[PDB]
Write a structure and sequence with these properties.
CATH topology of the largest domain in chain A: atp-gated p2x4 ion channel fold
Order of helices and strands of chain A: HEEEEHEEEEEEEHHEEEEH
Number of domains of chain A: 2
Keywords (chains A, B, C): ATP-binding, Calcium, Cell membrane, Disulfide bond, Glycoprotein, Ion channel, Ion transport, Ligand-gated ion channel, Magnesium, Membrane, Metal-binding, Nucleotide-binding, Receptor, Transmembrane, Transmembrane helix, Transport
Bound molecules: 2-acetamido-2-deoxy-beta-D-glucopyranose, magnesium ion, sodium ion
GO molecular function, one term (chains A, B, C): purinergic nucleotide receptor activity
Oligomer: homotrimer
Subunit structure (chains A, B, C): Homotrimer. Forms heterotrimer with P2RX2. Heterotrimeric P2RX2/3 has a ligand dose-response profile that is distinct from either homotrimeric P2RX2 or P2RX3.
Largest interface: A-B, 56 and 52 residues
Number of strands of chain A: 15
Function (chains A, B, C): Extracellular ATP-activated non-selective cation channel. Plays particularly important role in sensory neurons where its activation is critical for gustatory, nociceptive responses, visceral reflexes and sensory hypersensitization.
Distance between the termini of chain A: 19 Å
Organism (chains A, B, C): Homo sapiens (Human)
Shape of chain A: elongated
CATH superfamily of the largest domain in chain A: atp-gated p2x4 ion channel domain
Radius of gyration of chain A: 31 Å
């Protein structure tokens, strides 16, 4: 009966269209490269005011070289002119009553205890320690450099898909509405401007510059490179997303210590101990490309052929049986 | 004969179970993401004693920001108060007899030679050089800061599987037997404590803190994120492994030079030249996840179908022929 | 007719050889690992002359620790002895006529403006600013440290393929024609020498050390690890390639600012502001290995079987029809 092949031909048409759109949708005919080889170079611009001092790129930016990870110092605690010596630590947790509870057995991971219970002040008695004297008082409150919000982060990214030897950069003057020296990344009005306003990045990650500058934090300028190398070089485009990575028992925020080391005319050594709070930026470059390949096109093809081949039989069984 | 389909039905049962367990075992039905997007933040705590000086985080930790790569200085060679000038180098390899063998042709990659053969001491005659005077004597023996062993490395890691947009952190208070502020990673008793005792990491990598602190070395806190995103968020868990990366013609160990730069009241410049030996830590974040997908489930399915389909024929040939 | 199976047997022979060589060529029987876990340690050696000063590793290398990203300073602009204070900026773009155009509305991202239009010199009138005084004059011309060309970059790389737990290093004394302490990477005469002459790397990337040292730049020592773990450990070998990553509205080159911070006997603070130009090196470690696997061998096998199975029919149709 001719209806049997019009039933069969219909079977083939429908089933094969479903399969075809599914595999055509998932690019099963494509091999994929997911090991993006990126190089990141960053440049920060801005000047701020902290106390009655002006902070510039050399002052609040560390490291200075512009790696994929860099810090903009917003707040900082200065313990000026420390000197190797003996002095009572200021932390209440070192509170003692007698030199009997200031032995090595107490606070092992801590600083170096002399073994004397000394009077830091009249209201606290703490174990004495050898080290940079006097000790740091990390419990006071200090201002934050608000100008940092208008600072700007320029991200130049040069990536390479090595499986296809397809290298490209994120500087695209045609894709940017404005000039490169003056544009400013807006996810909508200019999503390819490589210049990000700090405060902008803070918002894109959904965070408040006040609390963030106060406690410090870690943000991620995520650069995504999802590309179809079957298409044009013009189509491999970077998409910027933004997220906070520290999120959140443990106290949020981010701070590190570094000393400026000065020496005296007679030769004794002294340093300015700096506990720095700021915003660390991590440029996370992800990317994956896909090219037409003979092999995955063939495994996907075989898959589709056999699949439709069983579908038409099971459907003959379901229709006939009904 | 009904035995033919009981022979055939048995064929199908057995062969199909083998194939089924193999593919079910290898998760061939799953697509996999192997491009983990990790952010690493580290914090070291401890104080040590070196000579009659106390070293703290600002002193022995570099860089101070807590990147994925950081150094804990254990030993260091100080050449204090160098000054641009002329002086005889101290290395025997620069030994000369006359200014005839101290020409540019000799030791090209080396320092800057003046061309004079001068008497460094009474027992060595070396070519004179222009630079930081006096020269470094990197052949003496110095102590090591043993307290570093009790120092602690806190690793906060925030990773993201971008193919499934599955981000998660390694801070897991439920998975940790003790509190987070006080736990200590033990591969067995607390394998999810993010705090690693330095000496502990040294042992997990199978190394002796004495020789290591003496010569310096490179260790890897490997964080593995093998995950089945078909399963629960609770199942994506990090596994910490540890390894030494420098291993091993070339001299083992690890050392770098940095100068503390000081200036004089009259304006001449002088620096403290520091050859630092220590332990570099590299947090190597690896990870791969797998989710059920229609496409790999289909290619794997087709594979299994055709495979069993040929197996039953070859087995009919082997049984019948016998 | 026996010719039908000699036609069919020929069909099978030819078609199956084509398919077989194609899949055997693409290693479809192999699973692949593309997430290389590399550790990079670098060491630079050399001394150069800048002005009448000698620069050594501690002077021109930053950071000093030898990460995967490091800078060799070739040129630098010194603004010595800056001091918080008030002074007219020197950039023409801050040119003013009256204090009316030196309000916060002007040059928002810039430094901190006092609001006074002051006379920097007799030929320029600029807005006054609070900060490090005097201001930087980044428009003059300075020399470059040419010795840097003969400097040497030693790259020790320890990678790990985690899907197969296959770790290995790039130090291969057997593969190197000469000793390790004295070899020098030549793509041809010694492609496994881990020591790269700076100038050499500059050439391999197709660049001129003069213009590059003048304006600074970013180069990539690309280490490739393409490996067949079905083969011997001796066959997993690294291949060094070289490329310039900044390439190229925006001004080429690379420069960053850092200050050396000095303090006075009476306590006022002053710094040497350094705008550094040099060559940044990025060791880009890529790698992918492939091992024989049951699963991809099976999907590829099924693929080939069905494929040839349809080929012989379409060819019977093409031959018969002809
Ligand atoms: C580490 O601390 C313990 C106290 O908790 C102490 O007994 C031990 O001596 C310390 N280790 C070193 C090497 O000082
Ligand atoms: C950039 O713009 C010019 C127009 O002058 C065009 O010819 C060129 O193809 C564009 N390049 C890309 C990569 O779009
Ligand atoms: C150096 O001078 C300071 C005060 O000027 C003094 O406190 C210190 O003890 C001196 N150094 C030595 C080794 O006496
Ligand atoms: C590099 O060293 C050689 C000696 O090995 C010397 O002849 C040459 O001039 C040096 N290159 C530069 C740029 O100084
Ligand atoms: C953590 O513990 C609480 C118990 O109070 C539990 O409800 C929660 O689901 C746990 N979270 C995870 C991720 O296990
Ligand atoms: C600065 O003073 C030191 C000793 O105080 C002296 O050696 C040096 O020559 C002086 N600087 C100059 C340029 O003379
Ligand atoms: C940022 O700059 C604008 C001028 O463009 C200024 O009005 C605004 O107050 C600045 N933001 C902060 C936080 O100072
Ligand atoms: C290195 O050379 C020695 C020859 O003494 C040889 O026995 C050894 O197998 C070689 N190792 C490799 C990895 O080629
Ligand atoms: C410190 O001395 C310098 C000159 O020696 C002077 O310019 C400065 O004003 C002094 N510091 C203070 C706070 O007066
Ligand atoms: Mg304290
Ligand atoms: Mg020496
Ligand atoms: Mg300027
Ligand atoms: Na298949």
């Amino acid at each position: 009966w001719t209806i049997g092949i019009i039933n069969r031909v219909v079977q083939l048409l429908i089933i094969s269209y479903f399969v075809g759109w599914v595999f055509l949708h998932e690019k099963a005919y494509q091999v994929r490269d997911t090991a993006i080889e990126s190089s990141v170079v960053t440049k920060v611009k801005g000047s701020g005011l902290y106390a009655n001092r002006v902070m510039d790129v050399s002052d609040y930016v560390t490291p200075p070289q512009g790696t994929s990870v860099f810090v903009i110092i917003t707040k900082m605690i200065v313990t000026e002119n420390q000197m190797q010596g003996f002095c009572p630590e200021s932390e209440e947790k070192y509170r003692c009553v007698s030199d009997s509870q200031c032995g090595p057995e107490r606070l092992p991971g801590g600083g170096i205890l002399t073994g004397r219970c000394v009077n830091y002040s009249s209201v606290l008695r703490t174990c004495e320690i050898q080290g940079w004297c006097p000790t740091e008082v990390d419990t006071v409150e200090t201002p934050i450099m608000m100008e940092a919000e208008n600072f700007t982060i320029f991200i130049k990214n040069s990536i390479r898909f090595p499986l296809f030897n397809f290298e490209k950069g994120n500087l695209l003057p045609n894709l940017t509405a404005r000039d490169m020296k003056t544009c400013r990344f807006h996810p909508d009005k200019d999503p390819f401007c490589p210049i990000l306003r700090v405060g902008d990045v803070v918002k894109f990650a959904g965070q408040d510059f006040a609390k963030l500058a106060r406690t410090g934090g870690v943000l991620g300028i995520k650069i995504g490179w999802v590309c179809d190398l079957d298409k044009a070089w013009d189509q491999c485009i970077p998409k910027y997303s933004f997220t906070r990575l520290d999120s959140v028992s443990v106290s949020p925020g981010y701070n590190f210590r570094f000393a400026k080391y000065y020496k005296m005319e007679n030769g004794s050594e002294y340093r300015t101990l700096l506990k720095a709070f700021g915003i660390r930026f991590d440029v996370l470059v992800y990317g994956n490309a896909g090219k037409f390949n003979i092999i995955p096109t063939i495994i996907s093809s075989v898959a589709a052929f056999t699949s439709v081949g069983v579908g038409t039989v099971l459907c003959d069984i379901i229709l006939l049986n009904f």
